[PDB]
Symmetry: D2
């Protein structure tokens, strides 16, 4: 049976890329998404096209809140349902890629109590709390699975950020969530090491800029990166993921790989 | 109208919080001792302190876990945290130093042997990270909401973190995650509040006053692991770094974490 | 024409594993060595047996000391000469892997001759040599007319994942690796213009010495969080092939650990 | 009983001079080392001696990794031992060591020999190799001192650089030497904790800028520092040294304190 892989935020951009790659490597993918249901399916189509039954599409709000079912469903629940939506269909889940991520200002000063305490649940859920549970569910299912019938390449990859050291002004929560994630990587790696589950992170610097920001803006940004003076492509990033998941890196765990074109070496 | 500096120390009830608060009080600060369940010890401290200097200490109970408390609508962590910064302004009309000391410290295995989780997820992250976030925020605004002329001259925020978070203690994943989120907060906060001359740093203890209940045999096991003096640090040693960062001897220091581990994080397995 | 890779200390153990791996990817390899002449040749033999003129050898003490000849040859000279050997023979040098490394105690607390020499040896092979080498290497890429340059210049520095937790008694060694780490980031930033990536691979525990009592060996391997065993040479070399592969072309000035989680442990 | 001795290298001017003074005013008897500023060394020695008789001396040595003329040429190590010897041979004690002396100039990889070989020795020598030796000489004396005749506060302090994670373009040799000095700090701290010798580093960001640097150059550097938009004074740096040597930091070892004003928190 082919290896299965869950990729949160597989709808568009990077997550979309990481999924294909894993698919191309011969992985049945569980394409996760939040708002974009179009792309999440447009993709699954193409994927199943290329190879019959090789891509499903689970949907879930990964923010740290509760959605209506009688009792509301916590974030833990929703998460434990994804990992669960795999063993249910393909009977296995070998690779998890916490990609899903909210990213926007959370200033400390100014120029709405709730906008914040909802962003907190947002930024902190997608980037850190959700990954914790996901990693936990994934780790249990393997634990439960009998020794004799376990996969041989369980790999977990959290998508962090290579610039958190030099915090992006005004993005406090995001930054905390991210560094909270790195800790998750390290901690997960050490503990889950026994079940032979690897946990590593990929720290992109300036990858595919937001489909939103203008051109003059993207220019100003990509021109700050030392290598090539351009942001990375979805590929230059996903390769690091497929590499981390391939056997060519089976002795690697609890580590983060920067893919920033030397961006983190620059100073103001 | 000179008036004495105010310091808000969360978890100032006992152990390190108490040491830090007493240390600050001793330097001349008036202190708002926050606590959660140690109502009696916090009162004892305050008592001791107000006997030395009248009206130089007050207490404030408040659960820093990221949940809501009963009041019309229940009260959110955000709100409760604003109440704290406000206590100082309401009582002394100022707040110059904040020390995020309050921290829940317990295991949260990824494997088996529910609700226990969701509470620990709100308790560990709220106390060690989210609460510190709202506090630094509220503390920062008041500074801004204050006239350039009536502004203190030594605003200092100190986040109590962990020096061993790089070598994750087995089983404490959320705590570890939270401590490092707190590190991000330290760096991020420092960068963003520089403009208001509010310094933000962290004190990273290795092994200080060991947990209250852990037995002798278990403790002395931990002491032989510290390269320097083969012991854990006293409270006075940890709190001494805290007074340093709040003194004008450190005014140009911000966004940094000072280790007080005795070399412990240099050791390998 | 086929890519060239210069691997210092490629005589045995890991360098031998890295050299052989690059060779497999199609790289033509220059196997430098210091004392291990026998092993280096045996390897060049095997490699040139799988493909004619796919490997050559070069001997050089990378210790920061002056050598024989007329006038003494500085470490710089030997270094630059090492790079020129690749250009003289295959007319191109694309990958440089600083692997050569002296590794032994230099206790702070106790003659002095021993010290002056450990300093030159330990800092020579781990930092000074790598510097000069990178420098000679970059010079060549620069002196090449834009049109003729290679499309994949990659430099990889072999460092250590346990430098943050100093191995008691190896100060000079630890100091040198830290300098090697600095070299990686500094060179990386300064060579980005020339499209020359500079990265590091930091193993934790791999192919233990050789003169390590099986008791002592099994000691260390039960300390490793993943598989409770040290790594293989191949597990460290896969990282090098990856860093030089085009699938890492946007990576530079970074270090990738291959410790199996060993650096995540405390005492 | 006696006054603590503090050996400060390159203590003739700037930061060094500020440290020797700060240490002196705390009660320490200081040994002012210099390379070329023999004049400044003297003005300072006179001043420190005027406030207190025989409370400071000067010692000249080239901390660069090159031999000098006396029978045989003197190695860097010899000179380093002579620096510590000087302290014991005058006060019978050496309690504090501040590795402040440091060469700092470009060593560009690309063209634009003997010019490098001398630079390599000077840079690495002063910034890393000498410090290793001075620490060694300093440590052996304590070791060859009976447990009871030992002081109650051995404190070594190395002046490092908070901006090495973001290498100053063109200064590779310098940057490596500092990283080396950083390793020295961690390693020496671990191996000297048994002798109760604390070893820490002070990481300045922008302090007394190198002179002959046009006002406009200095001003455009300061405007980059998040806090106060100015470089620090020498006092703001020495204040951190005096703290590390105080019993207020008696449990602190193997760490580096930044005094950069957040400048290392920024990004390009
Ligand atoms: N792109 C870059 O330049 C960089 C990216 N990174 C990291 O890479 C990872 C992916 O980045 P990038 O590809 O730009 O991200 P995308 O911007 O392409 O967004 C990924 C998405 O995951 C989903 N998501 C967002 N919030 C939530 C939530 N609360 N619950 C559930 N799902 C949510 C969304 O799905 P949607 O389809 O459903 O609505 C969102 O579009 C992140 O962890 C990011 O921080 C780091 C540095 C740089
Ligand atoms: N001492 C040590 O060995 C080490 C300490 N540290 C860090 O130092 C700081 C203090 O450590 P230490 O002195 O041991 O801590 P203590 O064990 O002092 O506990 C601090 C306390 O703050 C309060 N608190 C905990 N959870 C909550 C919550 N959810 N809401 C409100 N208040 C809460 C509690 O109050 P309570 O009395 O009022 O009810 C608790 O006693 C922490 O940040 C800790 O993580 C790091 C490494 C080691
Ligand atoms: N082994 C491990 O588990 C670990 C390895 N590393 C790093 O990986 C790399 C390879 O380590 P490992 O495989 O054990 O190394 P070995 O390769 O043990 O030795 C490499 C060699 O390079 C050469 N060399 C040593 N000193 C000098 C010198 N002064 N001048 C010139 N050449 C010299 C020698 O050549 P010789 O044969 O020709 O004469 C020596 O055999 C190193 O950089 C090491 O620091 C890091 C952590 C762990
Ligand atoms: N100034 C700043 O803003 C920053 C400083 N730092 C660190 O602070 C420390 C002091 O910096 P700064 O105050 O600018 O230094 P100074 O520029 O004041 O120079 C210190 C000196 O020590 C001596 N010295 C230098 N090279 C050698 C050598 N090869 N042999 C013997 N003596 C030598 C010289 O003595 P001389 O009088 O005798 O001839 C030299 O003037 C350094 O370690 C530096 O790396 C880090 C970041 C920023
Ligand atoms: C790559 N970089 C793009 C980018 C695109 N999507 C992402 N998505 C996630 N989840 N995480 C990221 N780190 C991320 N990064 C950036 C960097 C800064 C700003 C930015 O600052 N934007 C503000 C303006 C700046 C401000 O708040 O001061 C805006 O909303 O227009 C935008 C994109
Ligand atoms: C200093 N060190 C003590 C200590 C005391 N109070 C604190 N309080 C806070 N908020 N944060 C800390 N880091 C902290 N640390 C430690 C380290 C590990 C264990 C520990 O592992 N305890 C488990 C046993 C181990 C396990 O879960 O495997 C138990 O509950 O008995 C306890 C105290
Ligand atoms: C993987 N590890 C092996 C090892 C093998 N070759 C290497 N070669 C190089 N160039 N670099 C390395 N880091 C390296 N590491 C180790 C670690 C510690 C000791 C060790 O401490 N050996 C002393 C004993 C310990 C002591 O000095 O206290 C001895 O010479 O027997 C040996 C091998
Ligand atoms: C604080 N900062 C000053 C400064 C002054 N003295 C020092 N002295 C020592 N020993 N160490 C330092 N880090 C140091 N730093 C700086 C930073 C960069 C340049 C600089 O780049 N100078 C070149 C110009 C730039 C280049 O080579 O591209 C020159 O010589 O004019 C100078 C001073």
């Amino acid at each position: 049976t082919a290896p299965v892989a869950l990729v949160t935020g597989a709808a568009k951009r990077l997550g979309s890329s990481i999924a294909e790659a894993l698919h191309a490597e011969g992985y049945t993918v569980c394409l996760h998404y939040h708002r974009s249901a179009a792309d999440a399916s447009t993709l699954a189509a193409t994927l199943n096209a290329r190879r019959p039954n090789s891509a499903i599409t689970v949907q879930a709000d990964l923010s740290n809140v509760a959605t209506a079912s009688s009792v509301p469903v916590t974030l833990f629940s929703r998460c434990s349902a994804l990992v669960d939506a795999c063993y249910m269909h393909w009977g296995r889940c070998d690779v998890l890629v916490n990609n899903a991520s909210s990213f926007y200002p959370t200033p400390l000063l100014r120029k709405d109590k709730e906008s914040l305490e909802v962003a907190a649940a947002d930024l902190f859920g997608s980037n850190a709390i959700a990954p914790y549970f996901l990693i936990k569910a994934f780790a249990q299912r393997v634990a439960d699975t009998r020794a004799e019938q376990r996969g041989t390449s369980y790999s977990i990859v959290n998508m962090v950020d290579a610039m958190t050291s030099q915090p992006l002004l005004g993005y406090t929560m995001y930054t905390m969530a991210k560094e909270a994630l790195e800790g998750l990587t390290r901690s997960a790696a050490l503990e889950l090491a026994s079940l032979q589950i690897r946990v590593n992170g990929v720290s992109p610097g300036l990858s595919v800029l937001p489909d939103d920001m203008p051109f003059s803006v993207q220019e100003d940004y990509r021109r700050k990166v030392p290598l090539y003076q351009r942001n990375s492509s979805a590929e230059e990033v996903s390769d690091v993921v497929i590499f981390l998941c391939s056997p060519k890196a089976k002795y690697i765990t609890g580590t983060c790989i920067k893919v920033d074109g030397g961006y983190s070496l620059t100073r103001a």
